[PDB]
Amino acid sequence: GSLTEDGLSYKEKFVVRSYEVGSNKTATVETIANLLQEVGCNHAQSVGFSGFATTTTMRKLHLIWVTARMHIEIYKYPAWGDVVEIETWCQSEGRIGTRRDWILKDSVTGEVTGRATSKWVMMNQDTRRLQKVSDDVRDEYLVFCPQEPRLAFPEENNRSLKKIPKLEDPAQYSMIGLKPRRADLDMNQHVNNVTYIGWVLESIPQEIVDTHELQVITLDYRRECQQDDVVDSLTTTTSDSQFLHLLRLSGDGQEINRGTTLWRKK
Amino acid sequence: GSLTEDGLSYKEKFVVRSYEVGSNKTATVETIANLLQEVGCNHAQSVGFSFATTTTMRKLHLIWVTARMHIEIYKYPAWGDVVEIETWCQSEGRIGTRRDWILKDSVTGEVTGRATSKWVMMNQDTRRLQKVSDDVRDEYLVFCPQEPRLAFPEENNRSLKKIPKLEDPAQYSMIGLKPRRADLDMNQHVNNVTYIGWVLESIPQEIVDTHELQVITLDYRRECQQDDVVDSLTTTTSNDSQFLHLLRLSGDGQEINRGTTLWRKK
Numbered sequence: 001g002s003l004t005e006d007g008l009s010y011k012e013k014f015v016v017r018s019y020e021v022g023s024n025k026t027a028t029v030e031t032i033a034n035l036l037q038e039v040g041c042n043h044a045q046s047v048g049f050s051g052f053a054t055t056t057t058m059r060k061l062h063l064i065w066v067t068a069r070m071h072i073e074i075y076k077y078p079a080w081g082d083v084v085e086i087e088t089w090c091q092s093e094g095r096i097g098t099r100r101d102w103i104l105k106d107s108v109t110g111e112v113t114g115r116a117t118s119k120w121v122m123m124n125q126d127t128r129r130l131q132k133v134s135d136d137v138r139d140e141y142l143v144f145c146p147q148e149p150r151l152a153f154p155e156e157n158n159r160s161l162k163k164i165p166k167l168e169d170p171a172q173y174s175m176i177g178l179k180p181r182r183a184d185l186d187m188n189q190h191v192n193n194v195t196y197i198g199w200v201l202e203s204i205p206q207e208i209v210d211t212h213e214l215q216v217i218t219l220d221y222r223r224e225c226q227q228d229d230v231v232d233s234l235t236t237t238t239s240d241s242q243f244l245h246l247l248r249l250s251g252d253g254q255e256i257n258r259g260t261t262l263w264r265k266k
Numbered sequence: 267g268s269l270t271e272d273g274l275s276y277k278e279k280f281v282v283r284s285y286e287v288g289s290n291k292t293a294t295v296e297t298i299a300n301l302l303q304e305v306g307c308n309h310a311q312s313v314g315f316s317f318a319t320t321t322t323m324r325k326l327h328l329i330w331v332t333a334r335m336h337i338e339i340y341k342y343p344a345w346g347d348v349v350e351i352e353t354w355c356q357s358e359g360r361i362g363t364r365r366d367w368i369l370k371d372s373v374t375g376e377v378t379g380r381a382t383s384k385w386v387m388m389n390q391d392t393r394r395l396q397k398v399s400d401d402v403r404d405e406y407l408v409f410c411p412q413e414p415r416l417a418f419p420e421e422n423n424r425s426l427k428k429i430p431k432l433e434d435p436a437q438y439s440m441i442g443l444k445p446r447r448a449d450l451d452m453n454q455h456v457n458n459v460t461y462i463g464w465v466l467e468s469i470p471q472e473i474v475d476t477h478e479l480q481v482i483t484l485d486y487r488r489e490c491q492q493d494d495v496v497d498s499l500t501t502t503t504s505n506d507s508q509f510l511h512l513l514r515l516s517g518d519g520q521e522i523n524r525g526t527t528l529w530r531k532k
């Protein structure tokens with residue numbers, strides 16, 4: 001991987017692995033989401049940021065960036081053995097937080113095969129308290145971001161910024177008692193953000209997966225699932241097929257995530 | 267990746283990813299096991315096998331399934347490090363085949379790990395194990411070294427030791443483990459690496475935090491179906507810590523795997 005000529009974005013190529021593909025012999029959305037995370041980490045490392053991407057003031061004040069929203073749209077899933085090229089960049093969104101965007105391309109054709117956008121908010125890693133971005137922190141990372149806006153989803157009033165409602169009981173479908181194993185944790189022993197995508201998808205009926213391709217997934221992150229927590233995944237059809245999703249703790253029913261998926265007939 | 271000069275083995279380099287590492291910032295044994303599977307698949311593809319089956323195997327609806335996996339790691343590669351893996355196959359007469367691997371640090375050329383696996387022929391539909399016919403054995407022998415080449419040559423080596431059945435009550439357990447879609451391969455079967463993760467789930471976190479896994483030997487007796495539920499059982503048998511393991515279906519207690527692990531103090 002490498003920073004582009006201007007040093008304001010980063011590119012990396014990936015050959016899709018045998019274990020990374022599903023029943024259609026193309027990369028799963030969880031493989032795509034792991035590749036997005038990987039290119040994001042390699043971009044942070046290439047410009048001086050460390051197991052977290054933090055500025056100097058963030059380390060001093062015990063602050064971390066945490067995902068608030070992930071939105072991904074795939075037009076073509078790369079096949080096993082194919083080379084996919086991913087470009088990523090960060091943008092400041094004033095004191096609300098930061099945004100990390102991605103464009104996916106087929107390496108042979110140069111054609112855009114997917115795009116993603118993610119909203120990140122600042123939080124104290126000890127008290128878990130959300131904060132707005134201080135001027136000192138904002139000034140420490142702005143020189144690594146494009147100054148003029150660069151958006152993976154430019155269109156005014158597009159899918160990436162739509163408000164998601166809370167699924168009401170009874171859910172049409174459910175997958176209960178989901179628990180993370182050690183492979184679901186990252187190097188800091190936190191549940192990987194991609195695991196939540198998998199858990200959301202667990203309550204989609206197998207018949208939908210067998211006859212449809214996932215086109216869009218928007219996921220809100222409200223609370224983290226601890227290593228010893230148990231989760232219930234709920235799905236209701238709102239419609240192409242569209243679904244409304246909810247992940248909550250199995251016991252008290254505390255919300256951890258909410259989302260929507262859009263699927264196209266194969 | 268590429269076949270070596272003589273065409274009797276295959277080599278591939280991998281850069282260890284951010285999400286592939288554990289709390290020590292080095293690759294997990296499950297990352298290692300996925301890399302072994304990937305280089306094995308790339309070797310089969312490079313010589314004309316596309317499941318890795320011969321022509322007669324396709325005609326008779328036969329597949330190779332894992333009977334045993336044995337892995338020894340001296341050093342786990344760190345995040346961002348390049349690991350080089352060499353793999354080859356060997357005929358073991360009518361019993362089945364063996365796939366072996368050597369792992370090296372790309373910068374130093376030093377052997378950092380080694381693995382060996384035993385495969386048996388099985389009918390895809392009836393699930394009936396069988397010996398290798400001469401017609402099948404003659405179709406793959408020209409792709410294997412004729413003289414023996416062993417990753418574990420030694421006279422009394424750990425890779426071929428008989429594993430006993432854990433007796434109830436187990437010292438430790440992790441109950442109700444279920445596979446999600448990310449645990450399945452392109453043929454909708456549970457990936458062989460998932461069983462390694464499930465075995466490790468019943469090891470206490472304190473052992474994982476103070477020890478490094480040196481050796482794991484796993485026998486595969488029966489497959490876990492997509493809708494099955496598993497219980498993982500562990501009993502200490504032992505400066506080094508050794509454990510005996512058993513995976514069985516949560517309901518009837520039907521054995522799916524048995525194994526042993528050896529851990530050394532950090």
Ligand SMILES: Cc1nccn1-c1cccnc1
Pocket residue numbers: 043044045047049053054055090098141144145
């Ligand atoms: C670490 C950080 N905080 C806000 C933005 N970034 C950043 C910018 C460029 C590349 N990698 C990370």
Ligand SMILES: Cc1nccn1-c1cccnc1
Pocket residue numbers: 309310311313315318319320355363406409410
């Ligand atoms: C397909 C097969 N059956 C037994 C061994 N092999 C083989 C040989 C060489 C490379 N890849 C697989």
